[PDB]
């Protein structure tokens, strides 16, 4: 579409005491629930483990990422993860 999509920073925290950060790319018109699955898809960060943290959050996971701020690039998320995982598609 004529307006591109938006560079999101989340950091990933985990149970098991390590910290990451990942770059998403979304539009604001997204979701949390629609952006942890690619966060899943994309990291294998299982969505019951994911525990995503925003200023603006709501716990609902439905609500648009610009809803909970995410306008635009170099918007910044949370993310923790517990000590449960998934498994490999393969």
Not at 31 to 44: P, Q, R
């Amino acid at each position: 579409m004529p307006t591109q999509d938006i560079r999101l920073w989340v950091s990933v925290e985990d149970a098991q005491m390590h910290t990451v950060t990942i770059w998403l790319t979304v539009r604001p018109d997204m979701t949390v629930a629609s952006l942890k699955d690619m966060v899943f898809l994309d990291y294998g960060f299982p969505p019951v483990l994911q525990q995503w943290v925003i200023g603006q959050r709501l716990a609902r996971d439905q609500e648009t990422l610009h809803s909970h701020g995410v306008r635009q690039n170099g918007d910044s998320a949370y993310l923790y993860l517990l000590s449960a995982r998934n498994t490999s598609l393969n």
